[PDB]
Each structure stands twice: as structure tokens, then as C-alpha cells.
Amino acid sequence: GSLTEDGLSYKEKFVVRSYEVGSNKTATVETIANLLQEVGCNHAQSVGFSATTTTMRKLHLIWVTARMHIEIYKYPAWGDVVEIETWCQSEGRIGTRRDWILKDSVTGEVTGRATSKWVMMNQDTRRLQKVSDDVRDEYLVFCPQEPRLAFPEENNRSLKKIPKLEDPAQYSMIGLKPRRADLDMNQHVNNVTYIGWVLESIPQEIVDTHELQVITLDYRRECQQDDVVDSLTTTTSDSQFLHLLRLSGDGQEINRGTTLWRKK
Amino acid sequence: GSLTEDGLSYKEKFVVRSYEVGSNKTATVETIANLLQEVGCNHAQSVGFSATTTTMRKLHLIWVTARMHIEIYKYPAWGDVVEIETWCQSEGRIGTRRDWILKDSVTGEVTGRATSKWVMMNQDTRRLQKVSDDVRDEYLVFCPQEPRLAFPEENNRSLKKIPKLEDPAQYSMIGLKPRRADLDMNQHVNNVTYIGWVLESIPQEIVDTHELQVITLDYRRECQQDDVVDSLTTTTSNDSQFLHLLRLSGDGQEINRGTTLWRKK
């Protein structure tokens, strides 16, 4: 991987692995989401991050994902090479955004795109906060100054408000719990695990006859390593679904989302 | 990746990813096991397979893992490049063996080694069988003729018999179940998922203070996509050793047994 000529974005190529594909012999959306996190980490390393900047480390502040939105036109097949370009942008005091474009390396055709919203949190109190001027200034030298959007369209799917699923859910998968492979280097549940848990309550008949085109996921609260989650899904329709992940015991919301599926 | 000069082994380099590492910022043993499966698949593809031979497909036969044995001296760090070499060998009519050697790409130093035993099974009946002469001849042109062992030692750990853990277990993790990410392209549970499930019943205090040096796992029966598993562990021992058992949560049918050896950091 490498930063592009202007140093304001980063590109990396990945060869899709045998264990990374589903029944169609193409990459799962969780494999895609892991590759998006990997190219994002490689971009942060390339621009000098140990993605906390020096001012954030002094104030014990970290970036946390508020929303992930991914749209796939074609999933890369096993053995195929996918090229992913990523970049960041400041969204004033709200937080930051990281965008991605996925391309077929042979044809140069765009096969997918993604966007994510990040908010600042104090790592100890877990209290959310606005982005300060010092953090905005030290971040802005690594971002394009003019807007560059993976989802430019006004009122597009990536910005839509997601409602809360009402009981009873049409489908459910209960008792989901993370294992050590679901944790990151800081012993926190990996953001991609929540995508897998949301998808657990989609009936296999949909998975067997449809391809996932769009997924939007809001992250409200973290699942701890010792927590247990229930995954709930209701059809709202192409097939569209509304999703909710909540703690198995008291029903505290951890995520809400929507998925759009196209018949194969 | 590529076959070596003589065409009897295959090498591939991997850059360790951010999500592939644990608390020490080095690759987990499950990341290592996935890389071993990946280089094995790339080797089979390079020599013309798709690893069922022509005679195997005619008779509806497949290879299934009977045992996996991995020894790691140093886990590669995040961003490091690891080179893995793999090869296969026929073990007469018993089955086949696939071996691997892991090296640090910069220093050329061996950082790990692994071996696995495979047996033939009829895909439909699930009945095990001996390897026929036609199958043995068809895959012998892709294997070294002289023995080449990742574990040459006289009575090495990779061949030891594993006993059955007796109840009560010292530690347990109950109600483990696969999700879609644990399945392969044929909707079967990936062999690496069972390694993760075995390790779930090792106490976190051991994981925090020790490094896993050796794991040997016997595969007795498959966990189906709708099954639920219990992971059981008992200490058998500066080094800590454990005995492991995975069984179905309901009736207690054995699916795997194994042992792990850990060295204090």
C-alpha cells in the first residue's frame, strides 16, 4: 500500500483468500469490512500516527465509530485482487469521516463504496465530546481541503435516520457472545463482529437467493467481552430489513441498522 | 506465492494485518492456522487441483483433517512479513500429511512449524476409507519421494496419543455456536474455529502471562452449523500444559480432543 501522489489519500491491493469467501465463492461483507479497517489503519500509520494525534493522547481522547455504511455492486471472487482507496475529512466540531472506494484491479471498475462517521470520546469516562480547534488543525493537513465524498448525492442512504425495531421482531438469533478472535489488540469487540451479529438473524433463504447490496449500522454502545447479545430483524419491504442488537438480559440497545438485498 | 524450483513445495509471503493480532500486537494462533490453510489451498490450485484428484471426484471422496499440530517459537508482529513453505506427502494407505515451515522474511529464521494428518472420506455417507492405489499414484507426482518432515524428532509431540478429559473439568466455556463467518464456502465449520473454541476455556490469566508454544488437536466429528458446543480444559502440569475436550452441549458427543503447552512470558 501507499499514499497517493498528493499525500491526501491511501491505496492498497488485497488478494481475496480461501477462508474469506462465502457460498458464492466471493468475499463476505465481513471480509470487505475487515479490509476497510486494514487500509484505514495503514493510512493512519503512513501519515505519522502511532489514529490518535499528539493532542488527543495528552487529553486521553480516542476516535469511536458512530456509523458504518457500505454499498457493494460486485463482491470480489476468491483469488481476485481488489484495490481500495481511503481518505479522511473533518466534519467541523461534530467529528470526522473516513470514506473508501473499492475497485476491480484488472478492469479499474468501481465495485463498492463505504463511509463511516467517527466521534471523539474520553477513553476513561466514555463521555462523548466535540472536536477542539487544536485537534481539527493537526488533522486537517492530512485531509483534502475541498469536499471529497464517496456518497455525494443530497439526502442519500448513508445519512438516513434509522428507527428502533418494535417487539415482536419477525426473526431473531439469541445468545450471541464474542470469543477471543472477535476482540482487537486492546481487548475490545472488533466493529466488524457487530455486522456479523446483525446478519445472524437474516433467514438463510434470503442469503441463499439474494445478494447484500447496502448495510447501514449505527453503533450506540459497546458490547463488553463478557456481554451476551440478541440479534433482531423485521422485513420492512428487492428485500429490505430493519435490525436491532441488544443485550440479552436487560435489553439495552447496542446497535441499530438496515440492510437492502437484491434477488440473484 | 509460487511453487519452488523443483515443483514439490510452495511458498507464500503474508503481511500481518491489524485485525489479525492479539494483546501482544503479534498474530494469534488462529491467524497462523488461517494462513496455513490459505497457503495449502494456493499450493493445491498451483498443481492443478479443485484438493480432490480426478479419481476422488469420480468416487465422491474428499480429504478431511484428522489432526493438526502447530509449534510457534515467535509470533510475527503486526506489519511484519512471514514466509510460509508447505508440501504434502503420502502416508501409504493411511492417508496424507501436509507440513509447513514459517520463517521471518527479513532474518530467514524459522519462527514456527506445523503438520496435519488427512484421511479419505466418502462425502455422502461420511464413511472413512483407506487410500487406493489410483489415488496414491495420482498425487505422488506432486510430493517429494524421499521423506521430508517438519517434525523429524524420534518420538516427537506431533504423534502422541491424546487421552479423554474426565468430568469434572477444571475450566469450561459453554454454549459456543458458529456464526456465518465461521463457515467455509461449502457451509461447513472452518477447521480453525475449533482451535478458537478449544482456547475459549483457557483462563485469561494464562493468556495474559504466557505464550502458546504448542497445540495438538484431534478432529473426531464435525460440528454442524446448527450444533452448540462446550469447551472443557484441565491443567495437567515455568511451563503450563492443559488437556482439552470439545463436545456437543446436549448429549456430550465428542467432537475434538487436544493438548496445549504454554511458556511463561
Ligand SMILES: Cc1nccn1Cc1cccc(C#N)c1
Ligand atoms: C475467554 C473469553 N472469551 C471471551 C471473553 N473471554 C474472557 C476475557 C476476559 C478479559 C479479556 C479478554 C481478552 N482479550 C478475554
Ligand SMILES: Cc1nccn1Cc1cccc(C#N)c1
Ligand atoms: C444464521 C446461522 N448462523 C449459523 C448458522 N446459521 C444458519 C445456516 C443454515 C444453513 C446454512 C448456513 C450457511 N452458510 C447457515
